[PDB]
Amino acid sequence: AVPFVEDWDLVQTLGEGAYGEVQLAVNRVTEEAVAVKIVDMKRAVDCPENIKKEICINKMLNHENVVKFYGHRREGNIQYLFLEYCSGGELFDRIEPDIGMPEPDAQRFFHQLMAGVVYLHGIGITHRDIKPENLLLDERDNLKISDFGLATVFRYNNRERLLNKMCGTLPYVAPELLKRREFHAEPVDVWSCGIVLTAMLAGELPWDQPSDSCQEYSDWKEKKTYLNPWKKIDSAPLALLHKILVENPSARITIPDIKKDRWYNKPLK
Numbered sequence: 662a663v664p665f666v667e668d669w670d671l672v673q674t675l676g677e678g679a680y681g682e683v684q685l686a687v688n689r690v691t692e693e694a695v696a697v698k699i700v701d702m703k704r705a706v707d708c709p710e711n712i713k714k715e716i717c718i719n720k721m722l723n724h725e726n727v728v729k730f731y732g733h734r735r736e737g738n739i740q741y742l743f744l745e746y747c748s749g750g751e752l753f754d755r756i757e758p759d760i761g762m763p764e765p766d767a768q769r770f771f772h773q774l775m776a777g778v779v780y781l782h783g784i785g786i787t788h789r790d791i792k793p794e795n796l797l798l799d800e801r802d803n804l805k806i807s808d809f810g811l812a813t814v815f816r817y818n819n820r821e822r823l824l825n826k827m828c829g830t831l832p833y834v835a836p837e838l839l840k841r842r843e844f845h846a847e848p849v850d851v852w853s854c855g856i857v858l859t860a861m862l863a864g865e866l867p868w869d870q871p872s873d874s875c876q877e878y879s880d881w882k883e884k885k886t887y888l889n890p891w892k893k894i895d896s897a898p899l900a901l902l903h904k905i906l907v908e909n910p911s912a913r914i915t916i917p918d919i920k921k922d923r924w925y926n927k928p929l930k
């Protein structure tokens with residue numbers, strides 16, 4: 662057994678947050694870089710079960726568009742999660758403020774996003790907090806869904822389970838989560854992806870939250886796509902947003918039907 666391989670030099674901080682911090686670790690013998698999350702078990706009444714679900718969910722995942730899970734080390738309060746390192750950075754940082762990015766890149770990123778989501782959904786799981794900062798890129802620039810601290814399984818033994826728990830991030834959350842007591846999980850993730858598409862194509866977020874009390878939301882519902890934020894988006898991908906960002910979740914397009922959308926299969930464009 663090669664000596665010292667177990668040793669991981671904690672090179673630098675990747676991105677701190679409410680949880681704690683995520684440092685970049687490089688193998689002492691192979692120099693294999695990785696990402697280690699530090700979940701502070703501090704306090705005892707809103708920290709335990711939190712990470713326990715996040716870990717069992719990771720033990721299931723396995724797709725080229727989902728951050729890879731390696732292992733987890735326990736030690737009192739300091740829990741260590743070992744996940745794939747993404748030198749690419751966040752999709753967020755590839756979005757030019759107020760401009761977005763070249764339409765071809767967006768289509769490419771959207772494709773990988775759908776691949777990852779189709780997968781998660783396939784095995785009955787919903788991320789529930791899809792946004793540019795949770796979408797990572799690696800060396801080759803391949804999109805990776807990351808952060809399953811909020812995910813929850815919605816299908817077990819072929820039984821779907823309606824959700825009622827509110828979570829996510831207001832600008833990316835779906836409207837039925839603010840107006841209904843219960844809702845289907847799949848459609849909520851589709852709305853998220855939809856908001857991410859617009860962010861990529863226009864560099865700005867359509868609204869603070871999907872509620873009529875919000876200007877831009879009521880305008881979009883009225884289809885005032887002129888001059889407003891959707892003015893920057895070409896009609897092809899704009900047609901797809903009309904289908905995704907549909908209020909009634911039951912009338913909202915399904916992923917299987919997005920794969921058939923015109924702009925989705927338009928070469929380069």
Ligand SMILES: O=C(N[C@H]1CC[C@H](O)CC1)c1ccc2c(c1)Cc1c(-c3ccc(-c4ccc(O)cc4)cc3)n[nH]c1-2
Pocket residue numbers: 675676683696698715719728744745746747748749750751754797807808809810
């Ligand atoms: O955006 C980044 N840097 C910016 C560059 C421009 C400067 O202006 C500011 C910093 C950046 C670079 C490299 C990064 C990240 C973020 C996040 C991240 C990660 C990373 C991977 C997975 C998970 C994670 C996965 C699953 C789960 O259940 C919980 C957490 C969290 C964090 N690895 N490598 C990186």
